[PDB]
Amino acid sequence: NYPLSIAFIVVNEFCERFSYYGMKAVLILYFLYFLHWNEDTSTSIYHAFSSLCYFTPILGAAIADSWLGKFKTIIYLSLVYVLGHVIKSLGALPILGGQVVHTVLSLIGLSLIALGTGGIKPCVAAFGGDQFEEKHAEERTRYFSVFYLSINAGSLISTFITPMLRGDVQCFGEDCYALAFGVPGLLMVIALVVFAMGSKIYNKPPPEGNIVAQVFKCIWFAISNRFKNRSGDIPKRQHWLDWAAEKYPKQLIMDVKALTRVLFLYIPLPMFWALLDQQGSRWTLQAIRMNRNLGFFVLQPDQMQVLNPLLVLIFIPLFDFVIYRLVSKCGINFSSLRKMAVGMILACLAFAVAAAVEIKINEMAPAQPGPQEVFLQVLNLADDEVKVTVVGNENNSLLIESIKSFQKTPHYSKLHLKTKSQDFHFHLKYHNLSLYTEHSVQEKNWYSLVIREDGNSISSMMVKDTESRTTNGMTTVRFVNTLHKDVNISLSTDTSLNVGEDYGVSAYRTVQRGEYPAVHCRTEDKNFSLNLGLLDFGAAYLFVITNNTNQGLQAWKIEDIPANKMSIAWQLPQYALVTAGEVMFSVTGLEFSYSQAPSSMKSVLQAAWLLTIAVGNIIVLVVAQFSGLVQWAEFILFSCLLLVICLIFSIMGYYYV
Numbered sequence: 001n002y003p004l005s006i007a008f009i010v011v012n013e014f015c016e017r018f019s020y021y022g023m024k025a026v027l028i029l030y031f032l033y034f035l036h037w038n039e040d041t042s043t044s045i046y047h048a049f050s051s052l053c054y055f056t057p058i059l060g061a062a063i064a065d066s067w068l069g070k071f072k073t074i075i076y077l078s079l080v081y082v083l084g085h086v087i088k089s090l091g092a093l094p095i096l097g098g099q100v101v102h103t104v105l106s107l108i109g110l111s112l113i114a115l116g117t118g119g120i121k122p123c124v125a126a127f128g129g130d131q132f133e134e135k136h137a138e139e140r141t142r143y144f145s146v147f148y149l150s151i152n153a154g155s156l157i158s159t160f161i162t163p164m165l166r167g168d169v170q171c172f173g174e175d176c177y178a179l180a181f182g183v184p185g186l187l188m189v190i191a192l193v194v195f196a197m198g199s200k201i202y203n204k205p206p207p208e209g210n211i212v213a214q215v216f217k218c219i220w221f222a223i224s225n226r227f228k229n230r231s232g233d234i235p236k237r238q239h240w241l242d243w244a245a246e247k248y249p250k251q252l253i254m255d256v257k258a259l260t261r262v263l264f265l266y267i268p269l270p271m272f273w274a275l276l277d278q279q280g281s282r283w284t285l286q287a288i289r290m291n292r293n294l295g296f297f298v299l300q301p302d303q304m305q306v307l308n309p310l311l312v313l314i315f316i317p318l319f320d321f322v323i324y325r326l327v328s329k330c331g332i333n334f335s336s337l338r339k340m341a342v343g344m345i346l347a348c349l350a351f352a353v354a355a356a357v358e359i360k361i362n363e364m365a366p367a368q369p370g371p372q373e374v375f376l377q378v379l380n381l382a383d384d385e386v387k388v389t390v391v392g393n394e395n396n397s398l399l400i401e402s403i404k405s406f407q408k409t410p411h412y413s414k415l416h417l418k419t420k421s422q423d424f425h426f427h428l429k430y431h432n433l434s435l436y437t438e439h440s441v442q443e444k445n446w447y448s449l450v451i452r453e454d455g456n457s458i459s460s461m462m463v464k465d466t467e468s469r470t471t472n473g474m475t476t477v478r479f480v481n482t483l484h485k486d487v488n489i490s491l492s493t494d495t496s497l498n499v500g501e502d503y504g505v506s507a508y509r510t511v512q513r514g515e516y517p518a519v520h521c522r523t524e525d526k527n528f529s530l531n532l533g534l535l536d537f538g539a540a541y542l543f544v545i546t547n548n549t550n551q552g553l554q555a556w557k558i559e560d561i562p563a564n565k566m567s568i569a570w571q572l573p574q575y576a577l578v579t580a581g582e583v584m585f586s587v588t589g590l591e592f593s594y595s596q597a598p599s600s601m602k603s604v605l606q607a608a609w610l611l612t613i614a615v616g617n618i619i620v621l622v623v624a625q626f627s628g629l630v631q632w633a634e635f636i637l638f639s640c641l642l643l644v645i646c647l648i649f650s651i652m653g654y655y656y657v
């Protein structure tokens with residue numbers, strides 16, 4: 001009967017942690033691209049939710065167990081857990097009335113899901129242990145060992161799958177986040193059902209969750225009496241717990257004294273969790289700026305998180321089977337609390353790499369306009385070379401260029417404005433002809449001056465250009481119709497476009513990457529097909545439609561903007577380091593808490609263990625909002641900040657039993 005005894009719980013954890021991580025994998029992007037929040041506001045809310053996901057709900061969970069019991073609270077909390085998920089999915093639906101409802105509705109979904117996740121976590125994990133007596137200690141330890149693998153197993157599939165649905169389905173919108181949250185949401189229902197099937201297997205224990213509350217009362221009772229009395233003559237009885245000895249039994253006081261000693265080690269911990277929890281919130285914001293194209297399948301920005309769960313699955317049992325055997329062979333002193341000390345080092349070292357990676361992004365970043373600074377390109381469609389002089393408001397030649405027939409300037413020549421908006425007299429010369437052409441310009445934007453020809457005469461048409469190849473991170477097309485007839489274009493089954501006559505300009509249209517040799521299009525008179533050749537990822541193309549005696553519609557191909565040079569693969573070293581610390585810190589610390597607590601006090605540390613996680617994220621919240629540093633500097637800040645803590649932790653741990 002034992003083989004079926006605990007099967008349900010582990011399967012429930014996999015499904016349950018599948019749902020949670022999948023929802024939290026795309027959570028950061030959902031804020032940036034759907035609610036249109038800025039980075040600081042987007043990271044703040046995300047980490048607030050993660051902190052709230054552990055801060056209170058665990059305490060509520062233990063309190064719920066005080067009179068309701070472990071089994072029942074799982075069912076009820078898991079019920080509201082689903083409720084928060086389904087309502088969250090509704091918020092992502094664009095039909096629900098714009099950001100006014102989405103923001104308010106989503107945060108309600110986030111609030112409920114947070115309550116459920118941390119409300120069940122303290123109970124479900126310990127619930128499995130009670131399913132069989134601890135006399136099978138090795139099996140009990142095995143259960144927890146395999147249990148932690150199951151948690152990652154759910155994250156692995158969920159983290160890899162959910163980001164795909166965020167940009168692939170595009171059912172109701174180009175992104176369709178609703179399906180991304182929906183699939184995890186429905187899966188949690190399966191988790192609840194499977195867990196419910198185990199109700200007939202084991203006799204659930206009665207409520208006992210008064211342990212955590214009682215300990216807190218003793219401290220409050222002890223500290224208050226010492227603070228108020230202020231006798232001044234108190235001997236070593238000054239020890240606060242001795243004050244509570246007046247009321248509480250000696251055995252309870254003795255247990256708390258031993259418990260308090262170990263609990264000191266938890267004070268410097270939360271700074272470390274500020275690093276691991278930053279994976280999905282600030283490194284994904286970094287992966288956006290890096291090139292995603294690869295020889296393998298093109299990876300989504302946040303989909304890179306799959307590495308962290310993946311590396312945990314191979315580092316375990318690799319650390320236990322190999323690394324720990326080697327170090328113990330050279331020295332056995334390391335098979336102790338010192339493991340956690342090194343864990344803080346690697347994460348601190350991991351961010352140091354992130355600073356190095358971040359620096360290179362800025363170095364490889366292309367030139368950008370700025371305040372009273374504008375980027376201008378010039379394209380010549382005249383049959384012969386045209387000489388162009390950019391005469392500013394001072395009558396001085398701000399820039400001088402000469403462009404042959406059907407050619408463009410190699411780069412967006414930068415220009416400096418005297419105001420946010422300004423006009424410049426772009427003098428033109430064509431054969432013996434000359435003309436002063438004036439167009440308006442604005443700061444912080446790209447501009448393309450299209451010199452157009454009318455018979456032997458020429459004119460110009462200023463076209464505003466904006467970065468539209470990295471924001472969408474997908475191939476984009478652009479069309480100019482020099483004909484005196486509008487041209488209807490069926491770009492694909494997902495998009496269609498028409499270009500106005502007389503050098504009409506179309507808007508940026510995103511298209512699927514691939515070859516398009518037979519794009520169907522119809523003029524005002526007859527149908528036609530155009531060959532565009534290959535279109536690459538992350539590149540924008542501008543096509544000029546011209547009349548041809550034989551081809552009819554003749555299209556000239558020009559690359560509007562190239563792609564980035566920094567490959568996303570360069571982010572792997574970060575996860576290799578930080579995940580190495582996690583497996584060497586999270587796992588060992590968890591077993592340290594369960595085993596080092598006094599008798600029957602294990603529940604207190606399990607509560608304290610998650611608290612330091614919650615407090616850890618809040619540090620990221622305040623730093624991410626009220627600090628104001630440059631990102632490359634922030635990773636350095638955490639790297640050195642944690643390094644100091646590691647010294648404090650190691651020094652503190654050195655004197656522990």
